């Protein structure tokens, strides 16, 4: 398999270099050729990235997504000079679905607690916005710049929070998550909010493992904050369940107040599921 | 461990992109978020470097140092368009102690003889110096160009010399090392010069295997040039041990002229430390050189061996 | 060690044979001789019986209790024919203590699901009760006879519930437990009520293992009844924790009504614990 | 499995204690409670025993039967002091039905040759005889007393026969078996007859290993005596097959007199059975026996060999 991606990278570099020379040469036919070199890779790579969700090799999947992002940059590098908005719109919609699918990968990875893949998927998400932003520099919509910046910001806050879990302080992690959910509130994407919720669940599970049920109530409270901002019933179930898990550990600690809170918030999550 | 480094690096990516986007809008709030993140990254990365210095995985440290360089670039990029000096000053201070700690990492790696880590650390030092030089031009501290430039150039000359050690033309390595000490001496950080002296000790430690005692003395002549700036007693002590190793072999090789010159270098170092045990041990071997020159019947070299042995004794 | 039980049994047999002989061949000196042999055997066993709890071999422990019960039969026979209500007191105290200790053994075994020991301890309790009834018959204590009938009824009900658990019919077990709690209420012993509650906990644990949350709520409703009458906060805590298990399992089933009951039951247990 | 048996037994023991306590005190409610408890346990135990038989573990099944016999003892203890006939009838039904099942277990165990099961099963049967006796006396019925006595005597003969199967004295075994059929024929119990026949079959199987064809035929003469009352067609088949196996050994020994007696038994059984393949196999071997008796040339034996083989053909 691997050679495909390596050759696609070479073909993306060839399209980029041809366009660099073509602007010295003053030639549109080279731009047509380059656009075709790029499109022939892009459509096949998109199908591969979709296919890889069946195959489960998330390393090859995120590498294919990175190849798509790298191609998207080269496509923008042509399209911003070539003056056609359909080509820009194709690249933009492709990049938007690429970032969205990276979030879908990240949701699985963080549910599994594979922060390793999560940081790499978040890295794809951080870089992917740059192409949309450099497109928006030319298209003039500050709204796209805001979306792009926010997209990076939320994935960056998740990265900052993940570091505190690996460093082993759930309260610092929850404080960072409390920043992350505000960043996601500015961003306004439900699927990023699902990523936040899945992280907040994994954080709550960490806080239970460390016996810090009070911090776990905060972690779950952020989880249901994300769900209350953008609905997902299976999240709300998992959260409500986890909040009973927290209530049970709080019962084991004899802390009736934290147990009562954990029940009331478990009940809020159930009430939001409706 | 390595997860944290990835996270910090990718936080720097984020801050870099945040500045890249913000400069089209003039979004000071995005720049402020980025700056606060970059400061946090520096703070956490310093903690990481301190801990790694206990843990002994030098790669974690040097990667953290590259992250610190990248973060210092992000700080500088935000700072230069705000035009404030403190925003440059904090980054410069961080970068200086980062580079200084990196020189300790490089020194340890070169003393242990791990060229891989040496090359990595030296490259990190060149990158750190690039941030310092970029800041220096934009701020008008032209002497900071000199200090950055020398720190870079020396770090590169050390890497080049390491390549020449691996090829085996040790005098080409010494030719590089002569330029290396010259470059370092143009701004004069004693810690860099300690690292240079440790590289010259690596050259000497390798030359003992090869038996070109003549070129080994030329390497020691570089070593003492640097060591005479810095004054680290154990460096000077090691230089004396190498010079006596060189003498003991040069005696067996019958090249008492090179042996006498090795002693002439030995005292040049040993006098700076003033350790009587070294100075007496050195003078004792210097009379063994004189004895060997008499055993050759090499009258004038024996007179020079008397001169150097007595002059060495004359310092203790 | 085992030899000591076997020889203690032999001393009981010798004492039994002597007492049987003495009722034919009347002699107060032989009767006192037999009483001395018997009480000595009882106290010699008592040292082992108290020791065995430290040693943790519950089989040897309940076997030592079986020695004490068997000896108590002979003590009672000697005492009632000789006319010494003090020896009836000593035998009754030996039996009541041994039964109280056996109830604890049964509780520990039921917490393990090591029902083998529980059934045997209950068997010891039945034989102990048999002796107690023989004693009470001569004292005229109708209250103790009613207690023995109740005790044997309750131990039988526990045994039936245990059987229903090995069979896996938790509903039949709960139906039997509903009889058991009434029988224990009639008996008026909090430690028997603890055994009933511990059984009800183990029943609920089975229902949870099998996912039968509805029957588990019924089981918990019985358990908390027994605990509410007994007044043991450690039981009430364990009940509240198990009720939160049932609640989490109910959210796992998505059943809001069974969740609601499970929370109300956990809150009843909390309300009694204070 | 094991636990549930133990628990039921313990419930029966509890019912026993409760019935003792109640009968001492004279409280009617406690008697009624005991009766209710005992009945539900009995209903449970019956189902368990039916299932244990279908599981094919005879040992667990005979423990379940022992539990049922204990339950019947407690039920009878309650009933005989309570003063009602239907309670005693239920206990009698339980006891007899358990005994039927137990004898079927014993029959299987004897044909498998599992002495341990068979011995345990006889002990269960003896215990059932005790329970039957207690019921029968206090009910007041001479016919049921006669059942209990005759069954017990027949069981004792079966035990003696099992002991003879251990000991290897086949004459002692037949002496016991003669009394066993005497008791069984006085009783008219189909299962007791079935058991006696199966025991006689294993006695014969062992007598053949010893080569004692004579006593094997004496045992077969008892076997047909029983089987002719009972009408167990497959037992009649097993008997006839064995009678031919015995006759074949009597031919190999040249004891044509024993072989002709073995045929005389075989045809007696075959005439009850009406199994055509058996009848033809019997007549086939009857001619083989007559052929060897003609090779011996004993005229009076040949008149018998004629008479038997020809009568066999006259039925076939």
mmCIF file with all atom_site columns, N, CA, C and O in Angstrom, chain C residues 115 119 123 126 130 133 145 149 152 156 159-160 162-163 166, chain D residues 3-4 6-8 10-11 13-14 17-18 21 24-25 30:
data_model
loop_
_atom_site.group_PDB
_atom_site.id
_atom_site.type_symbol
_atom_site.label_atom_id
_atom_site.label_alt_id
_atom_site.label_comp_id
_atom_site.label_asym_id
_atom_site.label_entity_id
_atom_site.label_seq_id
_atom_site.pdbx_PDB_ins_code
_atom_site.Cartn_x
_atom_site.Cartn_y
_atom_site.Cartn_z
_atom_site.occupancy
_atom_site.B_iso_or_equiv
_atom_site.pdbx_formal_charge
_atom_site.auth_seq_id
_atom_site.auth_comp_id
_atom_site.auth_asym_id
_atom_site.auth_atom_id
_atom_site.pdbx_PDB_model_num
ATOM 1   N N  . UNK C 1 115 ? -21.535 -20.804 48.895 1.00 0.00 ? 115 UNK C N  1
ATOM 2   C CA . UNK C 1 115 ? -22.772 -21.216 49.540 1.00 0.00 ? 115 UNK C CA 1
ATOM 3   C C  . UNK C 1 115 ? -22.661 -22.552 50.269 1.00 0.00 ? 115 UNK C C  1
ATOM 4   O O  . UNK C 1 115 ? -23.414 -22.799 51.202 1.00 0.00 ? 115 UNK C O  1
ATOM 5   N N  . UNK C 1 119 ? -24.706 -23.162 53.662 1.00 0.00 ? 119 UNK C N  1
ATOM 6   C CA . UNK C 1 119 ? -25.646 -24.245 53.875 1.00 0.00 ? 119 UNK C CA 1
ATOM 7   C C  . UNK C 1 119 ? -25.228 -25.068 55.086 1.00 0.00 ? 119 UNK C C  1
ATOM 8   O O  . UNK C 1 119 ? -26.061 -25.379 55.930 1.00 0.00 ? 119 UNK C O  1
ATOM 9   N N  . UNK C 1 123 ? -27.092 -25.551 58.567 1.00 0.00 ? 123 UNK C N  1
ATOM 10  C CA . UNK C 1 123 ? -27.340 -26.875 59.127 1.00 0.00 ? 123 UNK C CA 1
ATOM 11  C C  . UNK C 1 123 ? -26.932 -26.931 60.598 1.00 0.00 ? 123 UNK C C  1
ATOM 12  O O  . UNK C 1 123 ? -27.712 -27.383 61.436 1.00 0.00 ? 123 UNK C O  1
ATOM 13  N N  . UNK C 1 126 ? -29.524 -25.207 62.498 1.00 0.00 ? 126 UNK C N  1
ATOM 14  C CA . UNK C 1 126 ? -30.699 -26.040 62.676 1.00 0.00 ? 126 UNK C CA 1
ATOM 15  C C  . UNK C 1 126 ? -30.494 -27.014 63.830 1.00 0.00 ? 126 UNK C C  1
ATOM 16  O O  . UNK C 1 126 ? -31.330 -27.103 64.724 1.00 0.00 ? 126 UNK C O  1
ATOM 17  N N  . UNK C 1 130 ? -32.419 -27.282 67.378 1.00 0.00 ? 130 UNK C N  1
ATOM 18  C CA . UNK C 1 130 ? -33.011 -28.523 67.884 1.00 0.00 ? 130 UNK C CA 1
ATOM 19  C C  . UNK C 1 130 ? -32.672 -28.693 69.361 1.00 0.00 ? 130 UNK C C  1
ATOM 20  O O  . UNK C 1 130 ? -33.561 -28.864 70.193 1.00 0.00 ? 130 UNK C O  1
ATOM 21  N N  . UNK C 1 133 ? -34.482 -26.105 71.493 1.00 0.00 ? 133 UNK C N  1
ATOM 22  C CA . UNK C 1 133 ? -35.866 -26.482 71.704 1.00 0.00 ? 133 UNK C CA 1
ATOM 23  C C  . UNK C 1 133 ? -35.991 -27.522 72.823 1.00 0.00 ? 133 UNK C C  1
ATOM 24  O O  . UNK C 1 133 ? -36.794 -27.340 73.740 1.00 0.00 ? 133 UNK C O  1
ATOM 25  N N  . UNK C 1 145 ? -39.184 -21.369 72.029 1.00 0.00 ? 145 UNK C N  1
ATOM 26  C CA . UNK C 1 145 ? -39.715 -22.344 71.074 1.00 0.00 ? 145 UNK C CA 1
ATOM 27  C C  . UNK C 1 145 ? -40.216 -21.656 69.802 1.00 0.00 ? 145 UNK C C  1
ATOM 28  O O  . UNK C 1 145 ? -39.858 -22.054 68.695 1.00 0.00 ? 145 UNK C O  1
ATOM 29  N N  . UNK C 1 149 ? -38.679 -22.165 66.024 1.00 0.00 ? 149 UNK C N  1
ATOM 30  C CA . UNK C 1 149 ? -39.507 -22.408 64.854 1.00 0.00 ? 149 UNK C CA 1
ATOM 31  C C  . UNK C 1 149 ? -39.232 -21.337 63.794 1.00 0.00 ? 149 UNK C C  1
ATOM 32  O O  . UNK C 1 149 ? -38.935 -21.630 62.641 1.00 0.00 ? 149 UNK C O  1
ATOM 33  N N  . UNK C 1 152 ? -35.492 -21.814 62.388 1.00 0.00 ? 152 UNK C N  1
ATOM 34  C CA . UNK C 1 152 ? -35.472 -22.921 61.445 1.00 0.00 ? 152 UNK C CA 1
ATOM 35  C C  . UNK C 1 152 ? -36.239 -22.564 60.186 1.00 0.00 ? 152 UNK C C  1
ATOM 36  O O  . UNK C 1 152 ? -35.773 -22.828 59.085 1.00 0.00 ? 152 UNK C O  1
ATOM 37  N N  . UNK C 1 156 ? -34.242 -22.254 56.636 1.00 0.00 ? 156 UNK C N  1
ATOM 38  C CA . UNK C 1 156 ? -34.787 -22.968 55.497 1.00 0.00 ? 156 UNK C CA 1
ATOM 39  C C  . UNK C 1 156 ? -35.027 -21.999 54.343 1.00 0.00 ? 156 UNK C C  1
ATOM 40  O O  . UNK C 1 156 ? -34.593 -22.255 53.225 1.00 0.00 ? 156 UNK C O  1
ATOM 41  N N  . UNK C 1 159 ? -31.817 -21.115 52.801 1.00 0.00 ? 159 UNK C N  1
ATOM 42  C CA . UNK C 1 159 ? -31.397 -22.263 52.009 1.00 0.00 ? 159 UNK C CA 1
ATOM 43  C C  . UNK C 1 159 ? -32.148 -22.302 50.681 1.00 0.00 ? 159 UNK C C  1
ATOM 44  O O  . UNK C 1 159 ? -31.543 -22.499 49.631 1.00 0.00 ? 159 UNK C O  1
ATOM 45  N N  . UNK C 1 160 ? -33.457 -22.050 50.696 1.00 0.00 ? 160 UNK C N  1
ATOM 46  C CA . UNK C 1 160 ? -34.274 -22.055 49.483 1.00 0.00 ? 160 UNK C CA 1
ATOM 47  C C  . UNK C 1 160 ? -33.842 -20.951 48.542 1.00 0.00 ? 160 UNK C C  1
ATOM 48  O O  . UNK C 1 160 ? -33.654 -21.189 47.357 1.00 0.00 ? 160 UNK C O  1
ATOM 49  N N  . UNK C 1 162 ? -30.886 -19.586 48.426 1.00 0.00 ? 162 UNK C N  1
ATOM 50  C CA . UNK C 1 162 ? -29.586 -20.029 47.939 1.00 0.00 ? 162 UNK C CA 1
ATOM 51  C C  . UNK C 1 162 ? -29.788 -20.997 46.782 1.00 0.00 ? 162 UNK C C  1
ATOM 52  O O  . UNK C 1 162 ? -29.252 -20.783 45.700 1.00 0.00 ? 162 UNK C O  1
ATOM 53  N N  . UNK C 1 163 ? -30.627 -22.012 46.961 1.00 0.00 ? 163 UNK C N  1
ATOM 54  C CA . UNK C 1 163 ? -30.909 -22.974 45.905 1.00 0.00 ? 163 UNK C CA 1
ATOM 55  C C  . UNK C 1 163 ? -31.437 -22.269 44.653 1.00 0.00 ? 163 UNK C C  1
ATOM 56  O O  . UNK C 1 163 ? -30.919 -22.484 43.562 1.00 0.00 ? 163 UNK C O  1
ATOM 57  N N  . UNK C 1 166 ? -28.508 -20.801 42.825 1.00 0.00 ? 166 UNK C N  1
ATOM 58  C CA . UNK C 1 166 ? -27.779 -21.779 42.019 1.00 0.00 ? 166 UNK C CA 1
ATOM 59  C C  . UNK C 1 166 ? -28.607 -22.235 40.811 1.00 0.00 ? 166 UNK C C  1
ATOM 60  O O  . UNK C 1 166 ? -28.058 -22.483 39.740 1.00 0.00 ? 166 UNK C O  1
ATOM 61  N N  . UNK D 2 3   ? -24.782 -28.452 44.999 1.00 0.00 ? 3   UNK D N  1
ATOM 62  C CA . UNK D 2 3   ? -25.341 -27.469 45.917 1.00 0.00 ? 3   UNK D CA 1
ATOM 63  C C  . UNK D 2 3   ? -26.850 -27.645 46.042 1.00 0.00 ? 3   UNK D C  1
ATOM 64  O O  . UNK D 2 3   ? -27.357 -27.739 47.148 1.00 0.00 ? 3   UNK D O  1
ATOM 65  N N  . UNK D 2 4   ? -27.576 -27.732 44.930 1.00 0.00 ? 4   UNK D N  1
ATOM 66  C CA . UNK D 2 4   ? -29.045 -27.792 44.965 1.00 0.00 ? 4   UNK D CA 1
ATOM 67  C C  . UNK D 2 4   ? -29.497 -29.052 45.688 1.00 0.00 ? 4   UNK D C  1
ATOM 68  O O  . UNK D 2 4   ? -30.366 -28.989 46.555 1.00 0.00 ? 4   UNK D O  1
ATOM 69  N N  . UNK D 2 6   ? -27.719 -30.606 48.063 1.00 0.00 ? 6   UNK D N  1
ATOM 70  C CA . UNK D 2 6   ? -27.406 -30.301 49.465 1.00 0.00 ? 6   UNK D CA 1
ATOM 71  C C  . UNK D 2 6   ? -28.471 -29.405 50.078 1.00 0.00 ? 6   UNK D C  1
ATOM 72  O O  . UNK D 2 6   ? -28.984 -29.684 51.153 1.00 0.00 ? 6   UNK D O  1
ATOM 73  N N  . UNK D 2 7   ? -28.855 -28.350 49.380 1.00 0.00 ? 7   UNK D N  1
ATOM 74  C CA . UNK D 2 7   ? -29.828 -27.401 49.881 1.00 0.00 ? 7   UNK D CA 1
ATOM 75  C C  . UNK D 2 7   ? -31.182 -28.069 50.097 1.00 0.00 ? 7   UNK D C  1
ATOM 76  O O  . UNK D 2 7   ? -31.790 -27.889 51.148 1.00 0.00 ? 7   UNK D O  1
ATOM 77  N N  . UNK D 2 8   ? -31.649 -28.870 49.143 1.00 0.00 ? 8   UNK D N  1
ATOM 78  C CA . UNK D 2 8   ? -32.912 -29.570 49.310 1.00 0.00 ? 8   UNK D CA 1
ATOM 79  C C  . UNK D 2 8   ? -32.826 -30.486 50.520 1.00 0.00 ? 8   UNK D C  1
ATOM 80  O O  . UNK D 2 8   ? -33.708 -30.450 51.370 1.00 0.00 ? 8   UNK D O  1
ATOM 81  N N  . UNK D 2 10  ? -30.988 -30.151 53.121 1.00 0.00 ? 10  UNK D N  1
ATOM 82  C CA . UNK D 2 10  ? -31.032 -29.296 54.283 1.00 0.00 ? 10  UNK D CA 1
ATOM 83  C C  . UNK D 2 10  ? -32.452 -28.789 54.525 1.00 0.00 ? 10  UNK D C  1
ATOM 84  O O  . UNK D 2 10  ? -32.902 -28.783 55.665 1.00 0.00 ? 10  UNK D O  1
ATOM 85  N N  . UNK D 2 11  ? -33.214 -28.453 53.489 1.00 0.00 ? 11  UNK D N  1
ATOM 86  C CA . UNK D 2 11  ? -34.611 -28.086 53.680 1.00 0.00 ? 11  UNK D CA 1
ATOM 87  C C  . UNK D 2 11  ? -35.396 -29.239 54.288 1.00 0.00 ? 11  UNK D C  1
ATOM 88  O O  . UNK D 2 11  ? -36.163 -29.029 55.221 1.00 0.00 ? 11  UNK D O  1
ATOM 89  N N  . UNK D 2 13  ? -34.165 -31.606 56.232 1.00 0.00 ? 13  UNK D N  1
ATOM 90  C CA . UNK D 2 13  ? -33.701 -31.634 57.624 1.00 0.00 ? 13  UNK D CA 1
ATOM 91  C C  . UNK D 2 13  ? -34.366 -30.532 58.436 1.00 0.00 ? 13  UNK D C  1
ATOM 92  O O  . UNK D 2 13  ? -34.774 -30.758 59.572 1.00 0.00 ? 13  UNK D O  1
ATOM 93  N N  . UNK D 2 14  ? -34.563 -29.360 57.844 1.00 0.00 ? 14  UNK D N  1
ATOM 94  C CA . UNK D 2 14  ? -35.286 -28.290 58.508 1.00 0.00 ? 14  UNK D CA 1
ATOM 95  C C  . UNK D 2 14  ? -36.730 -28.718 58.763 1.00 0.00 ? 14  UNK D C  1
ATOM 96  O O  . UNK D 2 14  ? -37.194 -28.636 59.899 1.00 0.00 ? 14  UNK D O  1
ATOM 97  N N  . UNK D 2 17  ? -36.725 -31.003 61.779 1.00 0.00 ? 17  UNK D N  1
ATOM 98  C CA . UNK D 2 17  ? -36.659 -30.246 63.038 1.00 0.00 ? 17  UNK D CA 1
ATOM 99  C C  . UNK D 2 17  ? -37.986 -29.561 63.341 1.00 0.00 ? 17  UNK D C  1
ATOM 100 O O  . UNK D 2 17  ? -38.460 -29.608 64.472 1.00 0.00 ? 17  UNK D O  1
ATOM 101 N N  . UNK D 2 18  ? -38.625 -28.948 62.346 1.00 0.00 ? 18  UNK D N  1
ATOM 102 C CA . UNK D 2 18  ? -39.828 -28.181 62.607 1.00 0.00 ? 18  UNK D CA 1
ATOM 103 C C  . UNK D 2 18  ? -40.941 -29.115 63.061 1.00 0.00 ? 18  UNK D C  1
ATOM 104 O O  . UNK D 2 18  ? -41.616 -28.832 64.042 1.00 0.00 ? 18  UNK D O  1
ATOM 105 N N  . UNK D 2 21  ? -40.310 -30.019 66.675 1.00 0.00 ? 21  UNK D N  1
ATOM 106 C CA . UNK D 2 21  ? -40.650 -28.890 67.545 1.00 0.00 ? 21  UNK D CA 1
ATOM 107 C C  . UNK D 2 21  ? -42.166 -28.780 67.683 1.00 0.00 ? 21  UNK D C  1
ATOM 108 O O  . UNK D 2 21  ? -42.706 -28.683 68.784 1.00 0.00 ? 21  UNK D O  1
ATOM 109 N N  . UNK D 2 24  ? -43.692 -31.754 69.757 1.00 0.00 ? 24  UNK D N  1
ATOM 110 C CA . UNK D 2 24  ? -43.455 -31.516 71.175 1.00 0.00 ? 24  UNK D CA 1
ATOM 111 C C  . UNK D 2 24  ? -44.420 -30.462 71.730 1.00 0.00 ? 24  UNK D C  1
ATOM 112 O O  . UNK D 2 24  ? -45.061 -30.686 72.756 1.00 0.00 ? 24  UNK D O  1
ATOM 113 N N  . UNK D 2 25  ? -44.545 -29.311 71.067 1.00 0.00 ? 25  UNK D N  1
ATOM 114 C CA . UNK D 2 25  ? -45.330 -28.200 71.608 1.00 0.00 ? 25  UNK D CA 1
ATOM 115 C C  . UNK D 2 25  ? -46.850 -28.394 71.471 1.00 0.00 ? 25  UNK D C  1
ATOM 116 O O  . UNK D 2 25  ? -47.616 -27.856 72.268 1.00 0.00 ? 25  UNK D O  1
ATOM 117 N N  . UNK D 2 30  ? -47.879 -24.528 63.487 1.00 0.00 ? 30  UNK D N  1
ATOM 118 C CA . UNK D 2 30  ? -46.532 -24.990 63.182 1.00 0.00 ? 30  UNK D CA 1
ATOM 119 C C  . UNK D 2 30  ? -46.570 -26.307 62.409 1.00 0.00 ? 30  UNK D C  1
ATOM 120 O O  . UNK D 2 30  ? -45.797 -26.476 61.467 1.00 0.00 ? 30  UNK D O  1
#
